[PDB]
Amino acid sequence: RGSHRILNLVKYDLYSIFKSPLTYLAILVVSSLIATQSILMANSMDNPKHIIVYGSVFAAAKWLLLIIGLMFVVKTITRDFSQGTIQLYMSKVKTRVGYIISKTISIILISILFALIHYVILIVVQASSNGKNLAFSKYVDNLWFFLIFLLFFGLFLFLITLASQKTAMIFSLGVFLVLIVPFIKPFITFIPRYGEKVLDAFDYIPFAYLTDKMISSNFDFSNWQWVISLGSIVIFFILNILYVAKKDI
């Protein structure tokens, strides 16, 4: 039935993730880099009695793991469109809808697993050193932020990959969308006489603040901001079902 078709598609997507060696090469490289950076920064400049603050490691590990997880999600989304096996899944309407459902569920499962991985890396780094332990609420709301970011970008890239059916554009567009705004703001926003106006107007464009809040080691959202983010995710999801059920290949 539909339940079996969704669970087998999510299960096979998970199986495909757990078998490739690039996943364990990425975790090894990130963990090695993060450990080297944390030890080098804490053991050499000021030279305290081995006190370590965890905000810098939190932010750095979060940013590196997110950019890799974004690429992993884009790869999972565009696998069938690259190989052309997508033409096998667009036979009827219930299968065409279950495909989108299964992709969303796979994104949720990868995000939950990835949050667990982030938990393991941060617990072992904290366990090795000594200092002031963090709180559970930080990890829980961090998990929520992980979910929100990955869902928003995965659905947006899902819509673009359905419209264009080209893969090299998705990879380049995803890299561009995540990485262009932090690069452009210092070199361009301080110039205009309209900059303060543009900065106030930045609270409603989803791209600017989702990318902006990436560097910070804690996220803070207003009620209006939360409302607009959930409304935007719902509109993209509804639009995806409508366009996938109305596009002709």
Partner: protein
Amino acid sequence: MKLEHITKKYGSNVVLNDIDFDFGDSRIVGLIGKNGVGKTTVMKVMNGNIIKFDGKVDIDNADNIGFLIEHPKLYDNKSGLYNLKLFAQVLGKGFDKAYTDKIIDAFGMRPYIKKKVKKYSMGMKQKLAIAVSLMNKPKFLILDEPTNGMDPDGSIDVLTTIKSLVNELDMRILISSHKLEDIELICDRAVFLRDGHFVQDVNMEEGVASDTTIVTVDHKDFDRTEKYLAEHFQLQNVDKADGHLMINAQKNYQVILKALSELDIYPKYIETRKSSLRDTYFNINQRGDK
């Protein structure tokens, strides 16, 4: 599965113009037409890849459809058993050990079933694709040229195996492909597509075959011979470019040969043979090229 008054158009261009289709008391059906006339458009419309139908399609939910289109779609990176298992779980009702063992054993893919698909050849990919198509356990099977790059022995073996499976499972097949002599071997009925319509529908069940006699002659004499033979006998088919005229079966050649001798026209070659789809296909479609 029936189609009624299907009309699909691309902008100003019209591809299908009020076509109809139905599996009426026929088990294997062949689809014949030229290149780029809209045969693949018909397969995508029939299978379900196209929603802007502009007709009525009567299908049941309990019946599955397994298909083969333009090129095989497979996971090149993974293995044959992974592909087989994945398409049985994701597309079919489940994975059946006895059923899968029987299909692999009947097709003969067991020696190379555990080696990677990227190490396969072209024919190997089509044979695996046919097994993947049957993996859904469908009620309707639509195939777009399944035997494109195979030797005559291999084509005979694959079609014979497919025919025996048409009795093992309650199956109904539509095959669109060129090289019609492979088609005439195992098919009960063929449909011919021209200008978006099915112009002719020849059905063959028993081997009576409506035997015919072929007379070949040059153009300057072909005009007179067609008129004279239409005035005397009943004429079945004509090909103007090659000067090929195909009257029905005549046991005695004496009255025709005597009349053509006092008529001063003479044939280049005379034989009697069962009519075929090569004759019908060329008769219908030689008008546009030359």
